[PDB]
Design a protein around this ligand. Structure first.
Ligand SMILES: Cc1cc2nc3c(=O)[nH]c(=O)nc-3n(C[C@H](O)[C@H](O)[C@H](O)COP(=O)(O)OP(=O)(O)OC[C@H]3O[C@@H](n4cnc5c(N)ncnc54)[C@H](O)[C@@H]3O)c2cc1C
Ligand SMILES: COc1ccc(S(=O)(=O)Nc2nc(-c3cccc([N+](=O)[O-])c3)cs2)cc1OC
Ligand SMILES: COc1ccc(S(=O)(=O)Nc2nc(-c3cccc([N+](=O)[O-])c3)cs2)cc1OC
Length: 445
């Protein structure tokens, strides 16, 4: 009945609330300070896309209305490319939520449910044999604490995950990507001056690099630049973080490549030199738990590239699943095994689907095969909105488990490919629709 959670982020704080109100004694430890303590100057955090499946996880926790109150409705996407004014491409919605706003709400929810939360305390080591762990603060205190069940919700660099290696082989494989990212900020004045639409997701596509911006209720926007770390050996002058040696270089790059975005980025030079360049990676594990003693949740279990906007959504789903299993199972070891069996297939799937979105960020001309496929898929979905559901729509706008969206997507892509092989005018749409009904079962099977 006792549980210790490391990491008061999105997954850890949600699972604290779900367990605490299910009668667990919950202690939650966080390395950062309490964002609920009002200071004189609020810091900036990123805005995240919350999709239907994440919103539904919050509804099960009884916190959806709270979060929605501070979330910006995004009705569609606005693509910005030179030579056209952007116009809204309508989506059904995606909510833009501020990370720290969400976190404060989750924290209040966890505490209201009876969890004890401890801030400014980082997990440094775990001794599984002696079931003790040690927390450290900046005051030099080294706090040794006893634990029964340990939930690692401590993010993509999990200290819990690292500790688990000492006692079990996690079968880790880290796959890195050549793009990094940089977080930047459009202020409310700038967005208003350039009439940036608050109720939309904004994209600046540019072949091998790109910017995406999500809104905040105060009309500021957080912008993410995705760009190669280094210029390719054979394409040595192409843009990369390696060339952008300082803020002035960054400014010249934005001026040249993102002319209409550069004016909105007032602290670009500042932001570029301070904010570290983030890495893109996928980490996969064969095992998420050590018997009944510890389990990994969210980014701690399954780091993924941020290209389908689903990491937080997955983490919130994870929390719901972990608390469901901990209640309905015989013992903790069985719960953790069952949890891993449910969610690890979903995690691998979204990790893969995220990478597939990522690889499209290319200046390579799209193969006419892939183009005809997508165009044919659109037609089929129109004719049988029943069965043929585009995979992105299954992921982003439904609650269908990721593994099942990936499976239906495979059946669908395969059908499209055999149909398109060897322009669309020669393709018999009746023959294709016949194959769609023969090969793709309705959702009710
Ligand atoms: C550029 C970018 C854009 C993204 N956009 C989206 C998006 O639009 N939508 C979406 O769904 N996802 C998005 N994601 C993914 C999303 O941020 C993560 O998947 C999600 O935050 C993971 O939730 P979590 O609780 O598992 O981890 P976290 O939210 O990272 O929580 C981990 C917590 O543990 C704490 N902690 C860490 N180490 C320790 C320690 N040793 N001791 C104690 N506490 C510790 C941290 O302070 C933190 O509070 C994005 C990610 C990136 C990088
Ligand atoms: C306009 O139609 C589309 C609808 C949906 C998608 S999607 O579902 O497949 N990908 C998605 N990425 C995000 C997302 C949000 C925040 C940050 C990031 N990020 O890359 O950091 C990604 C939201 S939806 C794509 C579409 O066209 C490309
Ligand atoms: C990995 O490759 C695929 C995987 C899955 C599928 S699918 O058949 O299951 N989903 C489909 N999406 C579209 C579609 C159309 C218009 C815009 C978008 N959009 O991402 O914005 C998608 C057409 S078909 C297709 C694939 O390539 C054709």
């Amino acid at each position: 009945r006792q549980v210790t959670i490391i990491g008061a982020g999105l997954a850890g704080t949600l699972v604290a609330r779900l367990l605490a109100r299910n009668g667990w004694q919950v202690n939650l430890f966080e390395r950062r300070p309490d964002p609920r303590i009002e200071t004189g100057a609020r810091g900036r955090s990123i805005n995240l896309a919350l999709a239907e499946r994440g919103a539904h996880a919050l509804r099960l926790a009884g916190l959806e209305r709270e979060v929605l109150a501070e979330a910006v409705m995004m009705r569609g996407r606005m693509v910005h490319v030179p030579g056209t004014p952007p116009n809204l491409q309508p989506y059904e919605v995606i909510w833009s939520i501020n990370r720290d706003r969400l976190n404060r709400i989750l924290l209040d929810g966890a505490e209201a449910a009876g969890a004890s939360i401890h801030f400014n305390l980082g997990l440094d080591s775990v001794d599984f044999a002696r079931q003790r762990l040690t927390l450290s603060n900046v005051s030099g205190e080294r706090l040794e604490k006893r634990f029964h069940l340990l939930i690692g919700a401590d993010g993509c660099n999990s200290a819990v995950r690292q500790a688990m290696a000492s006692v079990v082989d996690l079968g880790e494989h880290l796959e890195t990507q050549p793009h990094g990212y940089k977080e930047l900020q459009i202020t409310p004045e700038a967005s208003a001056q350039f009439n940036l639409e608050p109720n939309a997701l904004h994209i600046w596509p540019h072949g091998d690099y790109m910017c995406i911006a999500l809104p905040n209720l105060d009309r500021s926007f957080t912008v993410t630049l995705f760009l190669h770390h280094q210029s390719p050996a054979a394409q040595p002058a192409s843009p990369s973080f390696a060339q952008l040696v300082d803020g002035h270089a960054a400014r010249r790059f934005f001026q040249r490549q993102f002319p209409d975005l550069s004016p909105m980025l007032d602290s670009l030079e500042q932001d570029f030199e301070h904010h570290p360049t983030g890495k893109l990676a996928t980490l996969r594990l064969t095992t998420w738990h050590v018997g009944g003693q510890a389990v990994l949740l969210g980014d701690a279990a399954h780091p993924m590239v941020p290209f389908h906007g689903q990491g937080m959504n997955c983490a919130l789903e994870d929390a719901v699943a972990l608390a469901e299993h901990l209640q309905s199972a015989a013992d903790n070891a069985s719960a953790l095994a069952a949890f891993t069996a449910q969610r690890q297939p979903d995690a691998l799937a979204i990790q893969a689907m995220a990478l597939e979105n990522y690889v499209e960020m290319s200046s390579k001309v799209a193969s006419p095969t892939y183009l005809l496929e997508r165009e044919l898929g659109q037609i089929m979905a129109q004719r049988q909105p029943t069965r043929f559901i585009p995979r992105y729509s299954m992921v982003t706008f439904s609650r269908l488990p990721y593994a099942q969206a990936m499976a239906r997507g495979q059946i669908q892509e395969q059908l499209l490919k055999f149909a398109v092989a060897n322009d669309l005018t020669s393709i018999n749409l009746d023959a294709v629709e016949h194959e769609v009904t023969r090969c793709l079962p309705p959702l009710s099977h």
